[PDB]
GROMACS .gro file of N, CA and C in nm:
model
  411
    1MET      N    1   0.327  -2.669  -2.098
    1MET     CA    2   0.211  -2.750  -2.113
    1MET      C    3   0.107  -2.680  -2.188
    2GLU      N    4   0.083  -2.562  -2.142
    2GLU     CA    5  -0.013  -2.464  -2.201
    2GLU      C    6  -0.038  -2.348  -2.128
    3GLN      N    7  -0.115  -2.240  -2.182
    3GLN     CA    8  -0.144  -2.121  -2.120
    3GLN      C    9  -0.168  -2.141  -1.967
    4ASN      N   10  -0.142  -2.039  -1.887
    4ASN     CA   11  -0.169  -2.038  -1.757
    4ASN      C   12  -0.117  -1.904  -1.700
    5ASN      N   13  -0.161  -1.879  -1.566
    5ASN     CA   14  -0.119  -1.751  -1.505
    5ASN      C   15  -0.184  -1.765  -1.352
    6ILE      N   16  -0.203  -1.635  -1.304
    6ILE     CA   17  -0.263  -1.620  -1.170
    6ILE      C   18  -0.361  -1.743  -1.143
    7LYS      N   19  -0.474  -1.726  -1.220
    7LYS     CA   20  -0.571  -1.840  -1.219
    7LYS      C   21  -0.519  -1.966  -1.190
    8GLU      N   22  -0.432  -2.011  -1.277
    8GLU     CA   23  -0.363  -2.137  -1.274
    8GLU      C   24  -0.276  -2.151  -1.139
    9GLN      N   25  -0.206  -2.051  -1.094
    9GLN     CA   26  -0.137  -2.048  -0.976
    9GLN      C   27  -0.226  -2.083  -0.860
   10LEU      N   28  -0.342  -2.044  -0.867
   10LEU     CA   29  -0.446  -2.066  -0.764
   10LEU      C   30  -0.481  -2.208  -0.778
   11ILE      N   31  -0.533  -2.253  -0.878
   11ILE     CA   32  -0.558  -2.385  -0.899
   11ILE      C   33  -0.454  -2.484  -0.855
   12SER      N   34  -0.338  -2.473  -0.924
   12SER     CA   35  -0.225  -2.548  -0.880
   12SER      C   36  -0.216  -2.577  -0.729
   13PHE      N   37  -0.173  -2.460  -0.666
   13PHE     CA   38  -0.175  -2.470  -0.527
   13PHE      C   39  -0.288  -2.545  -0.458
   14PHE      N   40  -0.389  -2.472  -0.467
   14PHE     CA   41  -0.539  -2.532  -0.424
   14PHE      C   42  -0.535  -2.690  -0.443
   15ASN      N   43  -0.520  -2.717  -0.577
   15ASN     CA   44  -0.523  -2.862  -0.621
   15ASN      C   45  -0.408  -2.940  -0.539
   16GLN      N   46  -0.299  -2.862  -0.511
   16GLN     CA   47  -0.173  -2.920  -0.442
   16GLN      C   48  -0.206  -2.916  -0.298
   17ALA      N   49  -0.318  -2.912  -0.262
   17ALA     CA   50  -0.353  -2.899  -0.110
   17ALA      C   51  -0.452  -3.002  -0.079
   18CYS      N   52  -0.573  -2.985  -0.121
   18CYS     CA   53  -0.691  -3.078  -0.096
   18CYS      C   54  -0.662  -3.206  -0.143
   19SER      N   55  -0.761  -3.286  -0.151
   19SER     CA   56  -0.741  -3.416  -0.204
   19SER      C   57  -0.844  -3.444  -0.312
   20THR      N   58  -0.972  -3.509  -0.274
   20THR     CA   59  -1.073  -3.539  -0.356
   20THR      C   60  -1.158  -3.419  -0.393
   21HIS      N   61  -1.270  -3.432  -0.455
   21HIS     CA   62  -1.361  -3.309  -0.494
   21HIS      C   63  -1.452  -3.287  -0.385
   22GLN      N   64  -1.528  -3.385  -0.338
   22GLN     CA   65  -1.627  -3.373  -0.231
   22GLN      C   66  -1.563  -3.291  -0.116
   23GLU      N   67  -1.436  -3.298  -0.115
   23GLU     CA   68  -1.356  -3.225  -0.006
   23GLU      C   69  -1.423  -3.087   0.009
   24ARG      N   70  -1.434  -3.023  -0.100
   24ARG     CA   71  -1.507  -2.887  -0.079
   24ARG      C   72  -1.624  -2.889   0.003
   25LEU      N   73  -1.731  -2.958  -0.046
   25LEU     CA   74  -1.853  -2.967   0.037
   25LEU      C   75  -1.821  -3.009   0.178
   26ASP      N   76  -1.700  -3.064   0.187
   26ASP     CA   77  -1.675  -3.110   0.332
   26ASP      C   78  -1.594  -2.985   0.405
   27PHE      N   79  -1.517  -2.903   0.329
   27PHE     CA   80  -1.464  -2.788   0.391
   27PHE      C   81  -1.562  -2.698   0.436
   28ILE      N   82  -1.655  -2.633   0.347
   28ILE     CA   83  -1.762  -2.555   0.385
   28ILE      C   84  -1.809  -2.585   0.529
   29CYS      N   85  -1.816  -2.707   0.557
   29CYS     CA   86  -1.862  -2.756   0.696
   29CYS      C   87  -1.725  -2.773   0.770
   30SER      N   88  -1.661  -2.864   0.737
   30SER     CA   89  -1.527  -2.910   0.817
   30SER      C   90  -1.469  -2.775   0.859
   31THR      N   91  -1.457  -2.686   0.767
   31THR     CA   92  -1.387  -2.564   0.792
   31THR      C   93  -1.462  -2.480   0.909
   32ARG      N   94  -1.594  -2.466   0.888
   32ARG     CA   95  -1.667  -2.398   0.994
   32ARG      C   96  -1.716  -2.495   1.089
   33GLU      N   97  -1.639  -2.588   1.130
   33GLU     CA   98  -1.676  -2.691   1.231
   33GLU      C   99  -1.538  -2.761   1.281
   34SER      N  100  -1.442  -2.680   1.299
   34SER     CA  101  -1.317  -2.738   1.336
   34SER      C  102  -1.283  -2.684   1.475
   35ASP      N  103  -1.172  -2.590   1.485
   35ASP     CA  104  -1.136  -2.532   1.606
   35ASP      C  105  -1.027  -2.433   1.570
   36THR      N  106  -0.924  -2.471   1.494
   36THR     CA  107  -0.820  -2.382   1.455
   36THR      C  108  -0.837  -2.336   1.317
   37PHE      N  109  -0.921  -2.403   1.248
   37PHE     CA  110  -0.945  -2.382   1.100
   37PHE      C  111  -0.825  -2.372   1.019
   38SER      N  112  -0.717  -2.441   1.078
   38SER     CA  113  -0.589  -2.447   1.013
   38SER      C  114  -0.553  -2.589   1.002
   39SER      N  115  -0.621  -2.668   1.060
   39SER     CA  116  -0.587  -2.820   1.063
   39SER      C  117  -0.678  -2.900   0.964
   40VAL      N  118  -0.769  -2.819   0.901
   40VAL     CA  119  -0.863  -2.874   0.803
   40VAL      C  120  -0.782  -2.984   0.728
   41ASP      N  121  -0.851  -3.065   0.644
   41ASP     CA  122  -0.805  -3.154   0.558
   41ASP      C  123  -0.730  -3.103   0.451
   42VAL      N  124  -0.621  -3.021   0.474
   42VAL     CA  125  -0.558  -2.959   0.373
   42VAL      C  126  -0.417  -2.901   0.429
   43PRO      N  127  -0.317  -2.908   0.359
   43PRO     CA  128  -0.188  -2.854   0.398
   43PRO      C  129  -0.182  -2.704   0.388
   44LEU      N  130  -0.118  -2.649   0.496
   44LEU     CA  131  -0.095  -2.511   0.499
   44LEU      C  132   0.013  -2.458   0.411
   45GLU      N  133   0.098  -2.552   0.379
   45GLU     CA  134   0.216  -2.523   0.296
   45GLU      C  135   0.171  -2.471   0.156
   46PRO      N  136   0.077  -2.535   0.091
   46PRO     CA  137   0.029  -2.478  -0.042
   46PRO      C  138  -0.081  -2.380  -0.016
   47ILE      N  139  -0.169  -2.401   0.081
   47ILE     CA  140  -0.275  -2.316   0.111
   47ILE      C  141  -0.208  -2.171   0.136
   48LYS      N  142  -0.083  -2.172   0.199
   48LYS     CA  143  -0.019  -2.047   0.229
   48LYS      C  144  -0.009  -1.967   0.102
   49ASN      N  145   0.004  -2.049  -0.016
   49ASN     CA  146   0.032  -1.993  -0.145
   49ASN      C  147  -0.094  -1.937  -0.189
   50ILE      N  148  -0.212  -1.992  -0.159
   50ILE     CA  149  -0.341  -1.942  -0.197
   50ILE      C  150  -0.396  -1.848  -0.100
   51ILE      N  151  -0.309  -1.821   0.005
   51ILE     CA  152  -0.358  -1.726   0.101
   51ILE      C  153  -0.282  -1.593   0.084
   52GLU      N  154  -0.156  -1.612   0.036
   52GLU     CA  155  -0.078  -1.485   0.004
   52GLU      C  156  -0.102  -1.425  -0.123
   53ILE      N  157  -0.230  -1.431  -0.168
   53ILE     CA  158  -0.283  -1.380  -0.290
   53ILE      C  159  -0.376  -1.256  -0.274
   54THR      N  160  -0.437  -1.259  -0.172
   54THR     CA  161  -0.535  -1.145  -0.130
   54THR      C  162  -0.465  -1.055  -0.032
   55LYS      N  163  -0.328  -1.054  -0.023
   55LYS     CA  164  -0.253  -0.976   0.056
   55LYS      C  165  -0.210  -0.846  -0.010
   56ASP      N  166  -0.315  -0.801  -0.102
   56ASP     CA  167  -0.295  -0.684  -0.181
   56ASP      C  168  -0.414  -0.606  -0.188
   57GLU      N  169  -0.402  -0.461  -0.202
   57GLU     CA  170  -0.514  -0.373  -0.204
   57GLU      C  171  -0.601  -0.429  -0.317
   58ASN      N  172  -0.564  -0.371  -0.431
   58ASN     CA  173  -0.634  -0.400  -0.558
   58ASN      C  174  -0.689  -0.551  -0.551
   59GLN      N  175  -0.605  -0.634  -0.499
   59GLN     CA  176  -0.640  -0.775  -0.488
   59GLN      C  177  -0.754  -0.799  -0.400
   60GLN      N  178  -0.760  -0.749  -0.269
   60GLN     CA  179  -0.872  -0.771  -0.183
   60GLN      C  180  -1.005  -0.712  -0.264
   61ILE      N  181  -0.978  -0.591  -0.328
   61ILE     CA  182  -1.100  -0.541  -0.396
   61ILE      C  183  -1.135  -0.636  -0.500
   62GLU      N  184  -1.055  -0.647  -0.611
   62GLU     CA  185  -1.086  -0.727  -0.715
   62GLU      C  186  -1.143  -0.864  -0.669
   63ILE      N  187  -1.102  -0.904  -0.556
   63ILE     CA  188  -1.143  -1.027  -0.498
   63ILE      C  189  -1.294  -1.020  -0.444
   64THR      N  190  -1.313  -0.901  -0.373
   64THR     CA  191  -1.452  -0.875  -0.323
   64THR      C  192  -1.551  -0.912  -0.434
   65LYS      N  193  -1.541  -0.825  -0.541
   65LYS     CA  194  -1.642  -0.840  -0.653
   65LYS      C  195  -1.636  -0.980  -0.702
   66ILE      N  196  -1.517  -1.030  -0.712
   66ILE     CA  197  -1.493  -1.161  -0.755
   66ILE      C  198  -1.579  -1.267  -0.692
   67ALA      N  199  -1.578  -1.244  -0.554
   67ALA     CA  200  -1.655  -1.322  -0.465
   67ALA      C  201  -1.809  -1.321  -0.500
   68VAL      N  202  -1.831  -1.184  -0.510
   68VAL     CA  203  -1.975  -1.148  -0.539
   68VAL      C  204  -2.025  -1.194  -0.667
   69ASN      N  205  -1.933  -1.183  -0.769
   69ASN     CA  206  -1.950  -1.239  -0.903
   69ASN      C  207  -2.008  -1.382  -0.889
   70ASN      N  208  -1.994  -1.442  -0.777
   70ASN     CA  209  -2.052  -1.587  -0.757
   70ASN      C  210  -2.190  -1.571  -0.685
   71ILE      N  211  -2.177  -1.488  -0.581
   71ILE     CA  212  -2.292  -1.463  -0.488
   71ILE      C  213  -2.413  -1.403  -0.590
   72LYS      N  214  -2.371  -1.314  -0.648
   72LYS     CA  215  -2.474  -1.244  -0.741
   72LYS      C  216  -2.535  -1.351  -0.839
   73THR      N  217  -2.455  -1.459  -0.848
   73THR     CA  218  -2.505  -1.569  -0.931
   73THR      C  219  -2.578  -1.681  -0.859
   74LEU      N  220  -2.532  -1.686  -0.725
   74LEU     CA  221  -2.593  -1.784  -0.634
   74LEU      C  222  -2.744  -1.733  -0.611
   75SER      N  223  -2.761  -1.612  -0.643
   75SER     CA  224  -2.900  -1.553  -0.625
   75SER      C  225  -2.991  -1.605  -0.736
   76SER      N  226  -2.991  -1.723  -0.775
   76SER     CA  227  -3.075  -1.768  -0.873
   76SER      C  228  -3.046  -1.926  -0.881
   77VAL      N  229  -2.928  -1.969  -0.919
   77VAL     CA  230  -2.911  -2.108  -0.934
   77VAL      C  231  -3.015  -2.180  -1.005
   78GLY      N  232  -3.012  -2.167  -1.126
   78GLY     CA  233  -3.122  -2.234  -1.226
   78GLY      C  234  -3.249  -2.197  -1.166
   79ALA      N  235  -3.365  -2.267  -1.200
   79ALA     CA  236  -3.493  -2.262  -1.152
   79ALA      C  237  -3.538  -2.372  -1.065
   80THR      N  238  -3.509  -2.500  -1.113
   80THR     CA  239  -3.549  -2.612  -1.039
   80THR      C  240  -3.422  -2.659  -0.956
   81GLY      N  241  -3.367  -2.570  -0.893
   81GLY     CA  242  -3.234  -2.597  -0.821
   81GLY      C  243  -3.276  -2.615  -0.663
   82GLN      N  244  -3.178  -2.663  -0.603
   82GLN     CA  245  -3.186  -2.681  -0.451
   82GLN      C  246  -3.066  -2.665  -0.378
   83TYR      N  247  -2.966  -2.748  -0.411
   83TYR     CA  248  -2.838  -2.732  -0.351
   83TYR      C  249  -2.738  -2.634  -0.427
   84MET      N  250  -2.671  -2.554  -0.366
   84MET     CA  251  -2.569  -2.462  -0.422
   84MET      C  252  -2.449  -2.535  -0.473
   85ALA      N  253  -2.418  -2.646  -0.417
   85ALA     CA  254  -2.306  -2.733  -0.449
   85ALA      C  255  -2.305  -2.772  -0.589
   86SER      N  256  -2.431  -2.810  -0.628
   86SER     CA  257  -2.454  -2.847  -0.783
   86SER      C  258  -2.406  -2.734  -0.863
   87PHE      N  259  -2.388  -2.618  -0.816
   87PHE     CA  260  -2.348  -2.514  -0.894
   87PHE      C  261  -2.188  -2.502  -0.870
   88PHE      N  262  -2.121  -2.600  -0.889
   88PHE     CA  263  -1.980  -2.605  -0.877
   88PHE      C  264  -1.906  -2.723  -0.943
   89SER      N  265  -1.989  -2.847  -0.910
   89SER     CA  266  -1.933  -2.973  -0.963
   89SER      C  267  -1.907  -2.966  -1.105
   90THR      N  268  -1.995  -2.884  -1.173
   90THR     CA  269  -2.001  -2.868  -1.315
   90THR      C  270  -1.859  -2.779  -1.351
   91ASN      N  271  -1.854  -2.669  -1.317
   91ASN     CA  272  -1.742  -2.570  -1.346
   91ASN      C  273  -1.646  -2.573  -1.225
   92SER      N  274  -1.531  -2.637  -1.237
   92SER     CA  275  -1.437  -2.643  -1.128
   92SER      C  276  -1.343  -2.526  -1.128
   93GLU      N  277  -1.306  -2.479  -1.236
   93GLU     CA  278  -1.226  -2.360  -1.249
   93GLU      C  279  -1.274  -2.252  -1.171
   94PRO      N  280  -1.401  -2.218  -1.179
   94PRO     CA  281  -1.453  -2.109  -1.092
   94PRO      C  282  -1.484  -2.157  -0.954
   95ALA      N  283  -1.546  -2.275  -0.949
   95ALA     CA  284  -1.578  -2.341  -0.817
   95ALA      C  285  -1.441  -2.343  -0.730
   96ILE      N  286  -1.344  -2.329  -0.793
   96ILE     CA  287  -1.221  -2.342  -0.740
   96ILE      C  288  -1.174  -2.203  -0.678
   97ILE      N  289  -1.146  -2.117  -0.770
   97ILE     CA  290  -1.110  -1.971  -0.724
   97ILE      C  291  -1.205  -1.930  -0.610
   98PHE      N  292  -1.332  -1.965  -0.630
   98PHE     CA  293  -1.427  -1.925  -0.520
   98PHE      C  294  -1.398  -2.002  -0.387
   99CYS      N  295  -1.382  -2.132  -0.394
   99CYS     CA  296  -1.357  -2.223  -0.270
   99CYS      C  297  -1.239  -2.136  -0.205
  100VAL      N  298  -1.137  -2.090  -0.272
  100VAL     CA  299  -1.027  -2.021  -0.216
  100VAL      C  300  -1.088  -1.901  -0.150
  101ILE      N  301  -1.169  -1.816  -0.197
  101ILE     CA  302  -1.234  -1.718  -0.128
  101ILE      C  303  -1.296  -1.766  -0.001
  102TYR      N  304  -1.389  -1.847  -0.003
  102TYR     CA  305  -1.452  -1.894   0.113
  102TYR      C  306  -1.360  -1.920   0.218
  103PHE      N  307  -1.269  -2.033   0.202
  103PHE     CA  308  -1.170  -2.064   0.299
  103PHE      C  309  -1.103  -1.943   0.352
  104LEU      N  310  -1.051  -1.871   0.294
  104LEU     CA  311  -0.992  -1.739   0.332
  104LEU      C  312  -1.073  -1.688   0.443
  105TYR      N  313  -1.187  -1.638   0.391
  105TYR     CA  314  -1.286  -1.577   0.483
  105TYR      C  315  -1.312  -1.660   0.614
  106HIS      N  316  -1.332  -1.795   0.590
  106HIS     CA  317  -1.346  -1.890   0.689
  106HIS      C  318  -1.235  -1.881   0.795
  107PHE      N  319  -1.117  -1.843   0.743
  107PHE     CA  320  -0.998  -1.836   0.837
  107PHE      C  321  -0.977  -1.684   0.853
  108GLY      N  322  -1.063  -1.586   0.823
  108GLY     CA  323  -1.032  -1.447   0.840
  108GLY      C  324  -0.911  -1.403   0.777
  109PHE      N  325  -0.909  -1.416   0.657
  109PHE     CA  326  -0.783  -1.374   0.570
  109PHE      C  327  -0.818  -1.249   0.483
  110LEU      N  328  -0.911  -1.282   0.392
  110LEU     CA  329  -0.951  -1.178   0.304
  110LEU      C  330  -1.002  -1.049   0.370
  111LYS      N  331  -0.981  -0.942   0.307
  111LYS     CA  332  -1.039  -0.811   0.370
  111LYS      C  333  -1.140  -0.738   0.280
  112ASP      N  334  -1.220  -0.657   0.336
  112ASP     CA  335  -1.335  -0.589   0.275
  112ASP      C  336  -1.395  -0.491   0.375
  113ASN      N  337  -1.368  -0.366   0.342
  113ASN     CA  338  -1.409  -0.255   0.426
  113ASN      C  339  -1.568  -0.234   0.404
  114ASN      N  340  -1.642  -0.277   0.497
  114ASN     CA  341  -1.791  -0.267   0.480
  114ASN      C  342  -1.842  -0.348   0.589
  115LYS      N  343  -1.920  -0.265   0.680
  115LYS     CA  344  -1.982  -0.352   0.789
  115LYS      C  345  -2.122  -0.416   0.748
  116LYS      N  346  -2.184  -0.474   0.839
  116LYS     CA  347  -2.310  -0.549   0.795
  116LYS      C  348  -2.276  -0.676   0.708
  117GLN      N  349  -2.387  -0.732   0.672
  117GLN     CA  350  -2.372  -0.861   0.601
  117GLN      C  351  -2.283  -0.841   0.471
  118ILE      N  352  -2.194  -0.927   0.458
  118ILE     CA  353  -2.098  -0.908   0.354
  118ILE      C  354  -2.078  -1.058   0.294
  119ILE      N  355  -1.974  -1.081   0.225
  119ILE     CA  356  -1.935  -1.215   0.159
  119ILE      C  357  -1.942  -1.319   0.256
  120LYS      N  358  -1.830  -1.308   0.340
  120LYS     CA  359  -1.815  -1.418   0.437
  120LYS      C  360  -1.953  -1.440   0.504
  121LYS      N  361  -2.041  -1.345   0.502
  121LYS     CA  362  -2.175  -1.366   0.556
  121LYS      C  363  -2.260  -1.461   0.466
  122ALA      N  364  -2.267  -1.406   0.358
  122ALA     CA  365  -2.345  -1.480   0.250
  122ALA      C  366  -2.285  -1.622   0.211
  123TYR      N  367  -2.154  -1.619   0.166
  123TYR     CA  368  -2.076  -1.744   0.152
  123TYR      C  369  -2.102  -1.852   0.266
  124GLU      N  370  -2.111  -1.785   0.379
  124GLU     CA  371  -2.134  -1.873   0.503
  124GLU      C  372  -2.276  -1.913   0.497
  125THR      N  373  -2.358  -1.834   0.479
  125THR     CA  374  -2.512  -1.855   0.477
  125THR      C  375  -2.536  -1.970   0.377
  126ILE      N  376  -2.460  -1.999   0.286
  126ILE     CA  377  -2.471  -2.097   0.194
  126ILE      C  378  -2.377  -2.219   0.240
  127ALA      N  379  -2.259  -2.195   0.254
  127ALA     CA  380  -2.159  -2.302   0.287
  127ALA      C  381  -2.216  -2.365   0.421
  128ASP      N  382  -2.312  -2.318   0.487
  128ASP     CA  383  -2.370  -2.370   0.593
  128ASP      C  384  -2.498  -2.432   0.552
  129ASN      N  385  -2.590  -2.347   0.506
  129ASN     CA  386  -2.711  -2.400   0.456
  129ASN      C  387  -2.709  -2.520   0.380
  130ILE      N  388  -2.602  -2.511   0.293
  130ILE     CA  389  -2.575  -2.618   0.198
  130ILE      C  390  -2.541  -2.742   0.285
  131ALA      N  391  -2.474  -2.719   0.403
  131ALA     CA  392  -2.436  -2.835   0.489
  131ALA      C  393  -2.555  -2.879   0.559
  132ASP      N  394  -2.684  -2.824   0.521
  132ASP     CA  395  -2.800  -2.852   0.590
  132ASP      C  396  -2.849  -2.977   0.517
  133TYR      N  397  -2.817  -2.989   0.388
  133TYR     CA  398  -2.872  -3.091   0.288
  133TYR      C  399  -2.764  -3.202   0.291
  134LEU      N  400  -2.642  -3.175   0.311
  134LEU     CA  401  -2.536  -3.270   0.304
  134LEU      C  402  -2.566  -3.395   0.396
  135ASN      N  403  -2.519  -3.366   0.526
  135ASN     CA  404  -2.553  -3.469   0.612
  135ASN      C  405  -2.492  -3.434   0.745
  136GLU      N  406  -2.501  -3.300   0.781
  136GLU     CA  407  -2.450  -3.255   0.906
  136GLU      C  408  -2.301  -3.304   0.912
  137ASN      N  409  -2.231  -3.299   0.810
  137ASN     CA  410  -2.086  -3.330   0.798
  137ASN      C  411  -2.017  -3.224   0.726
   0.00000   0.00000   0.00000
């Protein structure tokens, strides 16, 4: 079809898991509002593929910064912004790779040596706060 690779591998799988788009905004919450965090509205079959990606050192690292690459950006979100979600509907490619990050952390998969507030912390601070404007869903 066309160029592709890791990035694609992620999209594919992920895309071959969830359903609609809003799902994401639903995950951030649904995810951190389930019980097993593995019954979410998504198959583990594919997710397992997007899960066995950060099972590598350099990976975990490259991922860490990767996650921050978004956080560092989430520390602005335009000027007249409000919801962080708006900062995804536009670019899915990234909003995807990221979504993967979150989920992982939401399921305690990704690794990152460093105590105190971290990604899962920030990502959660938003995934949650963002769920404060959604509709408690």
